[PDB]
Structures are given as structure tokens and as C-alpha cells.
Nucleic acid binder design. Sequence first.
RNA 1: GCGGUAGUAGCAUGCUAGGGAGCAG
RNA 2: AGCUGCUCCCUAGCAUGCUACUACCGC
Lengths: 72, 186, 187, 620
Amino acid sequence: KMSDVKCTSVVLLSVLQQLRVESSSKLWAQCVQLHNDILLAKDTTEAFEKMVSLLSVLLSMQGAVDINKLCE
Amino acid sequence: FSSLPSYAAFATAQEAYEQAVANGDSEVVLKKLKKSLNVAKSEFDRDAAMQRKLEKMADQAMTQMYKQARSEDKRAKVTSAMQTMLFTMLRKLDNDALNNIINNARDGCVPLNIIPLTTAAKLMVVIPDYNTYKNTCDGTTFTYASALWEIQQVVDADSKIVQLSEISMDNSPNLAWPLIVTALRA
Amino acid sequence: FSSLPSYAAFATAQEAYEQAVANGDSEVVLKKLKKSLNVAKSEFDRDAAMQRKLEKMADQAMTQMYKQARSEDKRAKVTSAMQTMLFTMLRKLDNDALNNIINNARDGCVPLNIIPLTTAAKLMVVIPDYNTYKNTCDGTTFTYASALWEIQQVVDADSKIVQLSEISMDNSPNLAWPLIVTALRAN
Amino acid sequence: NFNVLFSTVFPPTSFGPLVRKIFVDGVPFVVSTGYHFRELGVVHNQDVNLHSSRLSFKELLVYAADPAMHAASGNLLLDKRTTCFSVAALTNNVAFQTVKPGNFNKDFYDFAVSKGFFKEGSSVELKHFFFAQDGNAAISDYDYYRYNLPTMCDIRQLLFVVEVVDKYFDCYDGGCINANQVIVNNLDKSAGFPFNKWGKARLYYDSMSYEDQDALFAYTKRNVIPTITQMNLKYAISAKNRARTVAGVSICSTMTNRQFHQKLLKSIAATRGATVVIGTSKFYGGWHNMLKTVYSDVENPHLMGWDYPKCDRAMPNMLRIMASLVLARKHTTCCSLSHRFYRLANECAQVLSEMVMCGGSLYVKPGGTSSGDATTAYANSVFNICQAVTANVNALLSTDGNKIADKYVRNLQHRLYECLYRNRDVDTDFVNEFYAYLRKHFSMMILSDDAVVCFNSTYASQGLVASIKNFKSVLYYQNNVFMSEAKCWTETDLTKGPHEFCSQHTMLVKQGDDYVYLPYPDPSRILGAGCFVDDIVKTDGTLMIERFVSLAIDAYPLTKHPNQEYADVFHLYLQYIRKLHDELTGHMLDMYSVMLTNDNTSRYWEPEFYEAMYTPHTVL
RNA sequence: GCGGUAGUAGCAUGCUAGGGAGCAG
RNA sequence: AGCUGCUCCCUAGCAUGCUACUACCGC
Ligand SMILES: [Zn+2]
């Protein structure tokens, strides 16, 4: 289960980075920090809370049209 | 490779030698067909060698350029494939804490900061309508990210503080609806 | 390989061969026209195969010297670029203060880590946090390297202009914080 | 050794180059006409010339690589992020370089979970990932040079240890070579600063004829050329979040250090059965040869290994100088004496105190080795052997001499102290004797700081040879670091080889009729290389395939591991290669309408191909 | 009937050169 | 954007070597 969290954190940071999020230094520092904690986590719960904290960054933006990319 | 012109000549020579060895008549008359048949495999395996290597040459070059075409078409679409792959993995993940905020953002509750994780610390969640208010905020408690927050500073879009008891259905079309409802974690 | 002295001779030999084969007079005729195709073949052996190798050699040499010509052009271009860089960067350094600091050396050889110290016309500070900012660049003027500098154009990590009133204690967590203060040499 | 002490008193602002304003074509330049080291004193140029008419290509090259006129025309810099002495800022705004995360290759992960991998509670899990770094990543790692302190060395013992370390390197041969004998693999690398603004090393190796290089290399035997060095971050898989920095030296350093050192360098990389094992391969039964070389004849062995914590920055400056001197101790005929001293001065001015250009501004590197110059991998080995001999000397001297019963090592102790402190010149009889004793009781195997030591044990228990505490003490008081006893292991049953060497474990398996030692890797490393990649080319196996072949080659020896969940990695790799091949054929068939008329590719998805590479019969 | 040389094709080994990728310090 | 070292894969070339077929030459 945790491996899914690590892989999706890698993908999330990839999409965020290509979303020109590294042009705001504090934002990029927070994102990189959270990524490195997720990758070095040993239990699944704090991984998930850091995961949702990281996802909130992408959610706050308005570049990824969400109702489309969730076509199910 | 049998559809080459030299194969016909080789076949005629082979038939001639088969007839000769089936008759076994002379010593030199058949030896003619070692000066005319041993040659017949000289303009045959010289013409049927180069074409066979040409076939694999063409195949290897075609594969190389197909791979180059695929490589140029892949690195030019990354910023759609990354998002598709991400959302497929997310819906595979199946965690309620995620689904809550994903649905909420799908209808409008986009937070205006990083969701804090400490028991303290502040959160601000845009709410653009009233039906959205019905599900999330009830009284004084704010339900979001599968957590329990405390409502404190409802405000309209023209930067005017709007009280909590004012929020109701009939008087809802009286406010700048993009509310920014600041709260704190349990 | 079709316009060589040997194509004509081989053609004549084979023409005689076919003419007298259609005639078909004697076995010695066949022997002669076989020993003619078996010598005039040497003619097309070397006249059209060793010259087939000279072309390969000549092409190899021509491409080699083409490559060497390009090699010797790139040298001229890099030389021009390097000399222009030297002559354009020299133009900024020769202030009179450099003359004053070198002429007073016992020999004329001054250390390198004191030339910018006593001659540079602009200082660049980098501060990690407000605590270090207060003990280094507080106010519009400050003194470093036993000189007097005045501050202008304060910027941050995103390289956006930040005015001096913003950097208080409580406003500090709202700034990208490798702040880079640049100052001029007051006199 | 005395200048290292009497230089921590004078201001650190009056060191480095000793530039002077010379005139060329009626224009005043600023060129470096000397140097001022902490450990070598003042050194003056010999062929400096005022009033030059026109500059040649060599003059332009040597005047575009000096930091003198670079720094002397830049704005001052006061940097509070670091404690290292900043110098100047060429630009007008510092640049912050970040490190991106690695890409995900999902299809292989889907295949892995399909076969029953990554189940919770398994012995194989992901640990090697592509970490990311924030803005000020480079400088936060260059700051680690604050672990370098001016150190004093016990000289009356160094002038015995250097003799023994030199005797370790007598079988080889070296000397200066001409321009037409250098060998340069991969001639399309960067050319350092400021040359990387114009082209890779090919242009600078092409535009210079075979006499310009020799004129330059003979010029630096009477002169000093200070250089600037760039610092770059690596982009590679890792098991810890700390970033890695490597130094890209300018072309003017390598272009001459190669000609100086190449004969010796390629004479070490082509010798088999020695102490240093650079060059010897682990394939085709080479690893077994190493392991049986080290076990050679020691009586009651017990293994011992280690690795140095951050070797390149904690290393003092005396040991680097000694290493360079031991490397240059073979030019007894090609160079006279002053050529050798000026070449040593050029080395120390290039890779021991040069002006590091970290980011967009010159800094000053205090000390330690630069990891990207010509001779890191051999200087590290020399320094490692020095540490070993120092530990042996310390352990043999510091022992109650009335307790030793072997009447022969008591005499070794006595004459060892005699030749160490009392005497003044070499005692090659006793140096030979000590070398014999060492190689008889302390067999060794070396790479660049990754060592293995097989020692007689019924001696080290009595302090007659080194132990693992002795390296701790020596590192403490000389290298100025603490050797935590969680990086150095110790084994006692040689039937299992070293616990770890070059990051590969050793297993004794049955090959054919006999027993061999194979190195198997860490399975998480293999799986992490499978999943996490860069670019986008590699999220699709069809375009590459070959990397899976190489990884299956590396991940073979796990097939003989008793642990079940190790061999399945190899089997998964085989099945994935098969799927890749027979889906590539289908895709090409459906785009075109014929297939690969002949391939003979089946050998790739059968174990016979991979088995060949661990059997002693080379087929290169 | 042998030898030798000249040719042509096929095959092997090795050396150099060029390109791609992976591991270790 | 570093210095080495080992290993795989593809192609080219030269040389060497091996084998087969044809021609010439005397013996
Ligand atoms: Zn020499």
C-alpha cells in the first residue's frame, strides 16, 4: 500500500514541477521537503497526511482542469 | 529467395547434371557441366547474397527510424500523460481523506493554502455557493480533509465580514458568494 | 569502368569469339577464343579493379582534408571570441584606484584577494534570515571592509524588488529569504 | 609541515595569486605572476614578460583560465550563507539551481505487482529513489568544507610511512609522454570555466596542434597557472537525501596532467595480482581471483573492511601533497628537479586551493581533494595505504615491550623506534623487512577509499598489528573525523567473503564442479533502477530493451540465493524482456505488414546467455 | 595429375574507429 | 556540465587468417 503512496508522490511532484511551481521559492521548498519526507517514511498514516497536504498544493491552483481529468 | 533470374539457370544446370549422372555416359561431357554448373552457383549466390543482406539493412533502418519517431512523439505530450497517469493512480489509491478533497475541488472547495497538519494553524477554503455550504459547514464545525475544523471568520468577496447566523437560503442571494471561510484544526 | 582502353579490347575479343562461334569452324578456333577471353580477362581484372580502389583512396583523402579544414576554421573562431572577451572585460577594471594600489607595492605584485576589497564599486550581500540582516545591513548605510556603503535595490530569491520598510520581525516569514542586498561605495 | 602551522597566524586575505599589471600592445593587463601557498611559501614565475606585442593561442589560453582578471573585474561579494572565504561576484544576481525528481516507469511496476511483488511484509521493497532538492542546494553542500582544518602531521613518522607506501608501488613504471601518445575516451565532455561557453573538449583538443600541447606542457615546468573550477550536482538514484557535488576542472589542468601521469596511470590499470585492484573486473571469474589473492597465506585470518566518512572534504593537505609526491616519485630521469617542483606547485594551485566558482561567484576552497580532476582514484588509494601503514606503526610501537614473547617482533619494535625517531636517513634494509612483515600479516585490497583487509588474528588480539580501533584513533587525531563503528564491519568466517565491498555482497556457490564467489547486488537497487528513470524515452521499454538486458546481467547471481524473493527478481526481468520483445514485434507488424525476418534474440530471454558472464573463459 | 599466382564469394578471429546503454568509486 | 575503471549491443573499415568456386602458368 505504501509503495503506491511513494510512486504517486513522485508523479505528483513531477506534474507540479512541470506546472512551473518552482518559480516561487518558498512553495518549491515546501513541496520538495514534503516529497523527501514521504519517500523516507516508514509507516503508512503520516505518509497519507503528508500526501493530502502535498495534493492541496496542486488543488489550490487553476491550471489542471479537474472536472475533465476525472472523466472516470 | 527463389524468384530470381539466376535460379532458373541453376535449375536447368542441375537438371542437366541429374540426367548426366542418371546416364553416366562420358567423363568430359559431364565435366562441361562442372565448368557450366559450378559457375551457375557463382552468379546465383553472389546475387542472392547481397539482396538478403539488403533486406535486413532495410529492416534495421526502418526499426531505427520508427523508434526515433516514437521518441519524438512521446517527449512532446508529457504534460497530459503525467496528469492522466496521476489521476488513474489516485483513483486506484482509494483513501477517503483524498477523495473528500478531490470531490470538493471538483465542485469548488479549493483551499487557498497548504492544508496544515498540526492541531493548530490556519486554513482558508473558498466556497462559491450555498449547496456546497450545506454539506461542509454545519453550525460551528467545518468538515474537510476528513477532519474537524472550527469556523471563525466567514467573509464575502468584497472584503466585508459576514456573520455566521446570516447564512441561510432565503438571504443567500444577498452576499458576494465566493466566501473565504477561515478555520483551525481540532 | 566502361570508358577504359580495356573495354574496347575485351569487346573486340568477345566479338571475334561470337563471330567465329557462330561460324564454328575448328576446335582450335574455340581454343583461341577461349585463350583470348582468358587473357583479355586479366585486362578487365586490373584495369577495372585496381582503379576501383584508387577512387576509394582519393575519396578518403578528400574527406580527411575537408575535416581538417573545418578543424582549422573553428580555431580561428574560438581565438576571435576569446580575445574579444578578454578585451571587453578588461575595460571595466582599470580604475585609478587600481593604479594607486599597485604603484604602492614594494614590487608591483599585489595579492588577488585584496584587489576587489579596496577597489570594487559595488558590494553584494546575501542574508539567510532577518537575524543576520539586523547585524549586517540594518538601515540605509552600513560599513564593510573599512569603507562606507549605501543600500539600494534590495531583492529576494524570486528576484522581485523589496522595499526596506517591509523587512520587520513579524513580516519576515512572508519573504523569500535568501535576500540579496546590493550596495554602492559611498565617499 | 612547518609552513602549515606558521600560516594559521597571518591574514587569510593575503594568499593565492600575486598578480601584477603587465603591458601588452600598449594596454595594461592583470596576470598572475606567482603564487602564495599556505604550505609551500612564495613561488615566483620564471618566464613572465612585460611589454608583449601579440599573444599566441597558448597565451590566450593561459590568460583566459586565470582567475586574476576574472575576479579583478567583478563586484565584491560578502556571503553570509557560508563560512568559506568568498572573493567576488562576476554576475549581478546569484543563480539558484534545483534538482528535479526522477520519472516513473509505470508499466514495469504493473508487471511487478502482477507477479506478486511488493506485498506487505516482503523482504524486497523500494529504498533507492530520485530525491529532489530546493534552491540553495549546491551551496548548502559546498559549505561542508568547514570540516577541513589546518592539520599538523608527525613528520618523523611520515618520513617512514611514505617510504613503506612508496615500496608498495615499486612494480610499476611511469614517465612523461609526448602529445602523440595520450588517450582520451569520450572527447565530448565539458571544458570547465570559462571554456564551456564555446564548446566541449573536442574543440580545444583539435585547435591545438601536437606541438602547442607540448609547448604548454613544457611551459608549466617553470611557471604557475592558477585555474577556476566549476561545481555541479549529480542526478542519480540514491538511498539518502544528501546531494552530490563534483568539480569540473578546466581543460588547462587535465591537458597537462594527462601527459604527466598517463604512463603510470595506465600501468596501474593493467596489472593483475597487485594490492591496488583498479581495472580488474568481476566478470568471467575475476572476482574469485581477487578474493583468493587477498586470502593469500595468512595464518588465522579474520576479515576487516571500512569506508571513510566524506573522504574528499575531510582529507588534510599534507596527505594530498604526500600522495602527489609518491605519484611523482618515478620521474627520476625525464624531469630534473625544478621541473618536478613547479609541476607539484601547479598541481597544488589547481586542485588543492583553487577558486571554486560555486553558483555565479568565485569562492575559495580551503583544502581537500577535488573529486573531478585527473588522479582522484589513485591519490585516494595512496592515502588509504598511508592510513593503513600509520595504524600498523601506531599499534606496533604503543605496546608494552616486556609482554611480547616472540623474540623477533621485539627486535622489530626496537629497530622500528630506532629508525623512526633516532635516525635521519633511509634504512632500506629495514624498510624491506617491515614491508615483508606487513605483506605477510596484513594482506590488503584497495580501490579509491574502499578497502578490504585480511589479517592474522592471533596477532591483532595482542596488538602486534592493526585492529579496527586503531584506524579509529588514527582517523581521529590525523584525519579529524570520528569513525563510527557502524560503517566498518568485521568478519570471522572466510567461507563467506567480505560483508560488503564496492557495494556488492559475496556468495560462495557451486559452479560446474568447484566453488566460486559471486558478487550479488542489493535487490532494491535493481528494482529502483527498473522503475525510476529520467527523460521520457525510458517510460517505454520498447525504445530501450538493452538496459533491461544489462540489468538482468547484473542481477543474475541472485538466482543462486537461498532466499526465495531474490531469484524472482531475475525471473521477472527475464519475463519482462520476453514481453518487451514480442510486443515490439507485434507493434512493428501492425504498423508495417512483415516482421523481423530473423533476429536470433531468444538467447536474451534464456539463462544461457547470462550464465556465460560468470565462468572463467573470456570471449571479448 | 601436382604447384603457384591472379580473381570472386562465404566464414572466423583480432584490432581500430563511430554510436547507444548499464554498473562501481 | 567531472575523472577513471569494467561490461553489453549495433555498424564501418583495414589488415590477418581460414574455406570454397573460376582463370593463367610451367612442371
Ligand atoms: Zn617527467
